[PDB]
Amino acid sequence: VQLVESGGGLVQPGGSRKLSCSASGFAFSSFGMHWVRQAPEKGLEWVAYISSGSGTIYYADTVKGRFTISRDDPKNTLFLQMTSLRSEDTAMYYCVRSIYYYGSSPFDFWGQGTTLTVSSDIVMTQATSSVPVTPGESVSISCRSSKSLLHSNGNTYLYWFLQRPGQSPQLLIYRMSNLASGVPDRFSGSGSGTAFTLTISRLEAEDVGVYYCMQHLEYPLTFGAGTKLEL
Amino acid sequence: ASNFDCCLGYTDRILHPKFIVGFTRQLANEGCDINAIIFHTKKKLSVCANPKQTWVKYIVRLLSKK
Amino acid sequence: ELDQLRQEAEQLKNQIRDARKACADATLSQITNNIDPVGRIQMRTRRTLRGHLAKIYAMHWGTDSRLLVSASQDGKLIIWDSYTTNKVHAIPLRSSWVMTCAYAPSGNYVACGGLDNICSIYNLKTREGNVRVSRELAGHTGYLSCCRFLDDNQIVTSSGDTTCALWDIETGQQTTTFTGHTGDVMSLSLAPDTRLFVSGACDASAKLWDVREGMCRQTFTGHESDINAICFFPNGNAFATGSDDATCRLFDLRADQELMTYSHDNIICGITSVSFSKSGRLLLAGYDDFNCNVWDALKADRAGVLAGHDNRVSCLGVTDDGMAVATGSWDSFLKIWN
Amino acid sequence: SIAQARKLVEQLKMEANIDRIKVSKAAADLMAYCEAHAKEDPLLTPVPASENPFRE
Amino acid sequence: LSAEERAALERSKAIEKNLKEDGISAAKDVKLLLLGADNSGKSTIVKTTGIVETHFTFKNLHFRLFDVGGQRSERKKWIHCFEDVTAIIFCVDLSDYNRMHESLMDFDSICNNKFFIDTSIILFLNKKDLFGEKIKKSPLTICFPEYTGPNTYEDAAAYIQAQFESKNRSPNKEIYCHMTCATDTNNAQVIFDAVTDIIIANNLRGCGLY
Amino acid sequence: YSVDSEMLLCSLQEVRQFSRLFVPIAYSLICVFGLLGNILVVITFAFYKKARSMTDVYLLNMAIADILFVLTLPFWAVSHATGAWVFSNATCKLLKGIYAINFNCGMLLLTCISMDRYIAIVQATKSFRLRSRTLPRSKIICLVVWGLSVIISSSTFVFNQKYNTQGSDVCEPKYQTVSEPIRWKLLMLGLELLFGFFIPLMFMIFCYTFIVKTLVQAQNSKRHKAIRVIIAVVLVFLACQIPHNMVLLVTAANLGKMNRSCQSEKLIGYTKTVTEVLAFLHCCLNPVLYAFIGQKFRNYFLKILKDLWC
């Protein structure tokens, strides 16, 4: 598996540019695809999405009518065309794959991301900024929701992501309880209704990063503020 | 419907008006092919004539009333 | 010494015939009096699955008891979600003629074998998107009848070569071979503790093997035709055999005799499939006259009739928690009952 | 031929070393087992439309 | 009616639509079952081995031949799978007469069956010139000893063809018997002709005619 | 006065006295047996929707085109008896209108069945190869047949009215609107002649020639009965239809003459009732022959009879 994307540098304000994300090492035809932004001193936020077979398209509230998305199945490439750029789109842009059927893990693999610069709903809150830590101790991260994310079916739609310093963020936990493949057996997840908890047991070195909280109940996908673990 | 009685020929001699009491008008619009003026005399006959000749027009006027 | 060995075989057959006769104090039909009857049973068709364009031959539930598998002659293998009734996976098959298919208890693997004398393992949950073939095991001489996943690295397979063997999926070689029978083996069934299995063949007999040892212990002979279907009792101390002369039998293991027969004077055609209920008080049986009967398992009388398909009932399965029954047939539609 | 005979002789020997119980005991056990578990069987005794996971 | 449950439904309709396109594509093929005795020149006619499946194309039409050899089990048990096949192609060798009685009973077995009521047959007699060479010295009274006819070739073959028609006791089943000459005869044409009548005959039943 | 046997009105009182007793009984008898004959076929098909296909769908549509036609029929036997149209203007505009659609629709389904059987046998090998003929297609063609039947019948609805030509009230088309009266009559007469007799005649003879041509060369034991059915169906159509369409021409030939004699008109008068019934005889007999000759239909009819009766 390898997702690499390129194109974009510094532009003139109110211009235009294209972003190209080229995939290799899997069946591109089958998966859906997202675009996700990250401002230089802020958290993550959603942008756009296209389904498999180009059947359904959705955009964000902020960028509706200004940006456009398209895929090329024969050559395995994803395009994002953006026109009349304002002075608050200065951010990295990530390229994320996902799949939907009974018992699967969306947002499993992320891209590397390109730096673009421009020269001049469900509300979710994490009541933490920096949490003091020590190795060989158990800790707890708390994400509180606005309304209950439980549907008629038993399953609750809540995901937990981790970002290490100077790298791409990865999936830890999907659908609240279930654990992602390749992740160790130290992490555990619990919660009921609108209050949730991520519990870590015997934390060790190379396990400190910004932990993010995301819901997948309604479009558009809102993220958390993020929790930092110190040295 | 069907089998509607029609007048085929026109050809006749002129008839002095005193042998005429009653008359009708055959229509080319409805039932038959041609249009004509049938004449009923005291003897139970059924004389016919084309509508445009002077005598048929002269008698039909005078015997329109009484 | 052929005449000497021929009598030594006879004298022992005369002894075993007098052992089984001197054990029977009474029949079950005497002891099963003074109990309340089941009373008329009735079930309606809850759901119908459509997509296949040819005869359905096999199917299997999963331990989850929400997802199931099925196979047909068109060369496709579909995985259904029984609740929302939508397709999860549809796999293109290599050779068109398939007879059997299995589903692993972990829910990570699928098997299927046909008239190519080859059994193919398919790996679900790959790192990349698509499904592919994990391993292929071909060591048999005749067509494959049945196959059952013992574990994620152990599978049992019977054939029309009049033998069955145990495989190791990781190395892809035969571990042990079982040789007793003299006719084509039609079906087999695992015990609840995955220690013992029994098979039934076209010499009108059934045998009981030992997986870890590799020898037959007992042989049960009570039919007059080819045995088609076989199934263990939930307790794991009895089984029931379906045959091609419109009769089902009930055998015991601790006592070596046959304990009961099930037959009606109307029906005159062979049985294709048998299966027990969760408590094991009902016994379902598929016939080839477009009809599926429901027998009482102690009184030995009919307790109900499931509504007919357009063509022959080939395969039926009861689920683990025991909520539903599912049946397939040659008119290419699946139906779920309750 | 001798191989098939010498196998079949030793096969019939092993089948004659089994210890058997009466039909009465093996009968009462199956009847005893069924009575205990039959009370929570969903096909025998129908569950209502509340807990039925197929309709409602 | 959920975010994920709607995407899962969209995937199902994509699968549903995909396999029906293959269903239409696989209905434009002629399936043929190739039975007969072994060492009967079966290979020339086509122009732990489980099953050999061949394909050719002639005059813009796709043929599929399924040969069942080296199985050695109980036929009836696995003849259910080949229940509908456009036709059957049976092969016999006149070279040796001591495999005639075996081949004749075998034909009689397949001809009158539960599943093959209306399925018509094509019957190829091979090694034509080889049979007609050894009719000189070795008389025809060795097989079918009750009667033969004239000593020489031309009116002998008639007697065998008569036995195979006598074995047919079906009300509405045709047998298109042709003769093959050595290992240098065009047979694709002979089949193409025989296949046509079977399609015409099936369409007449479908129509108001007959 | 002195005029003798020249241009005298032609009395058609006698020709209608013959008609008074003859017309009602013929309609009444073929109505009952016609309705009884067809309703059987409509029920037998309705038993199993499953396995219905191709020629069966066209046969089912024909059976429907016969029931309505013969259900509409008895109101004119009541009119011929009474001898005065008592029913409302809307009745004369409806009953004459619908009857035209049912008759016109009946013929375009026969030419469909003919072209269906052509593709089936002559191009059997090619039709199998391309999958040319499928079940859903037929339903589109049926809608197109019903489409044209509405359009062609339009000219009938427009001109049909209620008025009193002679004696008591009658139900006839009246041309008061147009400029040229006889040209529109000649157009409306000619329109029915072409679609009635000339479209079907050419389509049948072409198809049923090239079917028989290839079917005599084929080697089979089923080709014998097939030819006997074809010839019989072709023979009947000619024996029933020809007389009326000849009489209908004789009308068109002299619809503007004045010298024409009465004896000629009187003779055409009688035979127009006698030749008119044979068109209704064929229309009510046709679908009963087509289906009942079929082997599969006859077997399934016996199946239901021997199962339901017990």
XYZ file of N, CA, C and O in Angstrom, chain E residues 23-24 27-30 59-61 86 172 174 176 192 194 196-197 199-210, chain F residues 55-56 117 120-121 124-125 128-131 133 211 215 218-223 225-226 229-230 290 293-296:
232
model
N -24.606 -12.983 -16.574
C -25.734 -13.906 -16.816
C -26.212 -13.870 -18.261
O -26.495 -14.954 -18.812
N -26.295 -12.672 -18.854
C -26.702 -12.445 -20.275
C -25.573 -12.937 -21.193
O -25.886 -13.577 -22.216
N -25.224 -16.835 -21.903
C -26.420 -17.452 -22.529
C -26.245 -17.584 -24.051
O -27.204 -18.047 -24.704
N -25.074 -17.219 -24.594
C -24.774 -17.202 -26.054
C -23.780 -18.321 -26.401
O -23.016 -18.144 -27.377
N -23.803 -19.432 -25.654
C -22.824 -20.548 -25.760
C -23.572 -21.872 -25.952
O -24.672 -22.020 -25.382
N -22.985 -22.789 -26.727
C -23.510 -24.163 -26.984
C -22.710 -25.143 -26.117
O -21.499 -25.314 -26.379
N -17.949 -20.389 -37.768
C -18.997 -19.616 -38.491
C -19.740 -18.701 -37.503
O -20.984 -18.633 -37.574
N -18.991 -18.027 -36.620
C -19.488 -17.020 -35.641
C -20.459 -17.683 -34.653
O -21.605 -17.209 -34.535
N -20.014 -18.742 -33.967
C -20.778 -19.414 -32.879
C -19.807 -20.174 -31.967
O -18.958 -20.916 -32.501
N -27.172 -28.840 -24.597
C -27.811 -28.721 -25.935
C -28.003 -30.056 -26.664
O -29.024 -30.206 -27.366
N -40.321 -39.055 -28.397
C -39.924 -37.785 -29.073
C -38.430 -37.506 -28.840
O -38.103 -36.483 -28.197
N -34.659 -37.732 -31.223
C -33.986 -37.905 -32.541
C -32.552 -38.403 -32.314
O -31.981 -38.081 -31.254
N -29.105 -38.329 -34.740
C -28.425 -37.874 -35.983
C -27.101 -38.629 -36.140
O -26.047 -38.072 -35.776
N -22.469 -28.619 -36.688
C -23.135 -27.315 -36.960
C -24.523 -27.539 -37.575
O -25.456 -26.807 -37.194
N -26.370 -30.466 -37.262
C -27.143 -31.235 -36.256
C -27.659 -30.303 -35.152
O -28.804 -30.509 -34.701
N -28.443 -27.122 -35.424
C -29.461 -26.212 -36.025
C -30.869 -26.782 -35.820
O -31.731 -26.038 -35.306
N -31.079 -28.043 -36.220
C -32.377 -28.772 -36.141
C -32.908 -28.770 -34.703
O -34.133 -28.593 -34.531
N -32.341 -26.593 -32.244
C -32.791 -25.214 -31.882
C -34.146 -24.946 -32.556
O -35.050 -24.436 -31.862
N -34.278 -25.278 -33.848
C -35.539 -25.140 -34.645
C -36.654 -25.943 -33.958
O -37.759 -25.384 -33.791
N -36.370 -27.196 -33.582
C -37.313 -28.144 -32.936
C -37.796 -27.596 -31.584
O -38.983 -27.799 -31.264
N -36.911 -26.944 -30.818
C -37.221 -26.348 -29.487
C -38.127 -25.121 -29.650
O -39.019 -24.942 -28.795
N -37.892 -24.304 -30.684
C -38.658 -23.057 -30.963
C -40.095 -23.398 -31.384
O -41.003 -22.636 -30.992
N -40.295 -24.481 -32.150
C -41.637 -24.954 -32.602
C -42.522 -25.256 -31.387
O -43.700 -24.866 -31.421
N -41.973 -25.916 -30.361
C -42.681 -26.235 -29.088
C -43.075 -24.932 -28.377
O -44.204 -24.873 -27.848
N -42.179 -23.938 -28.367
C -42.397 -22.602 -27.774
C -43.504 -21.825 -28.475
O -44.259 -21.125 -27.775
N -43.593 -21.938 -29.806
C -44.649 -21.313 -30.655
C -45.972 -22.077 -30.510
O -45.980 -23.150 -29.871
N -47.048 -21.539 -31.094
C -48.377 -22.179 -31.165
C -48.376 -23.438 -32.022
O -49.257 -24.294 -31.797
N -47.438 -23.546 -32.973
C -47.275 -24.712 -33.891
C -46.968 -25.968 -33.067
O -46.226 -25.846 -32.074
N -47.523 -27.120 -33.469
C -47.417 -28.436 -32.778
C -47.985 -28.315 -31.356
O -47.284 -28.009 -30.388
N -45.012 -15.636 -27.428
C -46.310 -15.782 -28.138
C -47.459 -15.814 -27.125
O -48.578 -15.409 -27.495
N -47.201 -16.315 -25.916
C -48.260 -16.394 -24.875
C -48.772 -14.983 -24.552
O -50.002 -14.818 -24.476
N -42.933 -15.398 -35.278
C -42.699 -16.787 -35.764
C -41.655 -16.818 -36.890
O -41.059 -17.892 -37.085
N -38.171 -16.430 -35.191
C -38.066 -17.674 -34.390
C -37.415 -18.807 -35.196
O -36.502 -19.441 -34.644
N -37.872 -19.055 -36.431
C -37.554 -20.286 -37.223
C -36.502 -19.976 -38.298
O -35.506 -20.723 -38.355
N -33.333 -18.646 -36.495
C -33.262 -19.357 -35.192
C -31.813 -19.378 -34.693
O -31.585 -19.082 -33.500
N -30.888 -19.738 -35.586
C -29.425 -19.859 -35.326
C -28.837 -18.491 -34.945
O -28.057 -18.453 -33.974
N -30.484 -16.885 -31.522
C -29.847 -17.550 -30.351
C -28.483 -16.906 -30.056
O -28.151 -16.729 -28.866
N -27.732 -16.565 -31.112
C -26.316 -16.105 -31.059
C -26.228 -14.702 -30.439
O -25.323 -14.492 -29.606
N -27.122 -13.784 -30.832
C -27.119 -12.356 -30.400
C -28.099 -12.118 -29.242
O -28.097 -10.982 -28.725
N -28.899 -13.122 -28.855
C -29.965 -13.012 -27.817
C -30.962 -11.923 -28.245
O -31.376 -11.115 -27.386
N -34.200 -11.872 -29.365
C -35.604 -11.947 -28.878
C -35.604 -12.195 -27.362
O -35.092 -13.255 -26.942
N -41.257 -19.498 -44.073
C -41.295 -20.499 -42.962
C -41.374 -21.900 -43.585
O -40.440 -22.689 -43.361
N -38.789 -25.349 -43.751
C -39.333 -26.377 -42.819
C -39.554 -27.718 -43.540
O -39.700 -28.731 -42.830
N -35.741 -29.436 -43.497
C -35.304 -29.886 -42.150
C -35.613 -31.379 -41.966
O -36.651 -31.835 -42.487
N -34.738 -32.101 -41.251
C -34.917 -33.539 -40.898
C -35.398 -33.624 -39.441
O -34.633 -33.244 -38.533
N -36.644 -34.068 -39.241
C -37.341 -34.100 -37.926
C -38.684 -34.827 -38.090
O -39.129 -34.984 -39.245
N -39.298 -35.245 -36.978
C -40.619 -35.927 -36.922
C -41.721 -34.966 -36.447
O -42.877 -35.421 -36.341
N -41.387 -33.694 -36.183
C -42.326 -32.648 -35.688
C -42.726 -31.680 -36.814
O -43.636 -30.860 -36.572
N -42.087 -31.767 -37.989
C -42.314 -30.845 -39.139
C -43.630 -31.179 -39.861
O -44.114 -30.308 -40.612
N -46.927 -32.081 -38.550
C -48.084 -31.381 -37.922
C -47.978 -29.865 -38.149
O -49.036 -29.234 -38.343
N -46.758 -29.311 -38.115
C -46.459 -27.861 -38.229
C -46.991 -27.294 -39.553
O -47.619 -26.216 -39.515
N -50.944 -27.213 -39.800
C -51.465 -26.055 -39.007
C -51.327 -24.769 -39.838
O -52.325 -24.030 -39.928
N -50.142 -24.509 -40.408
C -49.836 -23.271 -41.194
C -50.866 -23.115 -42.320
O -51.512 -22.052 -42.370
N -56.039 -20.634 -32.393
C -54.583 -20.398 -32.174
C -54.081 -21.130 -30.922
O -53.089 -21.878 -31.031
N -54.945 -25.356 -30.502
C -54.041 -26.181 -31.366
C -52.723 -26.440 -30.618
O -52.167 -27.544 -30.793
N -52.246 -25.467 -29.829
C -51.014 -25.564 -29.020
C -51.038 -26.755 -28.072
O -52.078 -26.964 -27.416
N -49.932 -27.504 -28.002
C -49.782 -28.739 -27.184
C -49.718 -28.365 -25.697
O -50.519 -28.919 -24.914
N -48.798 -27.461 -25.341
C -48.473 -27.053 -23.945
C -49.723 -26.500 -23.243
O -49.967 -26.899 -22.084
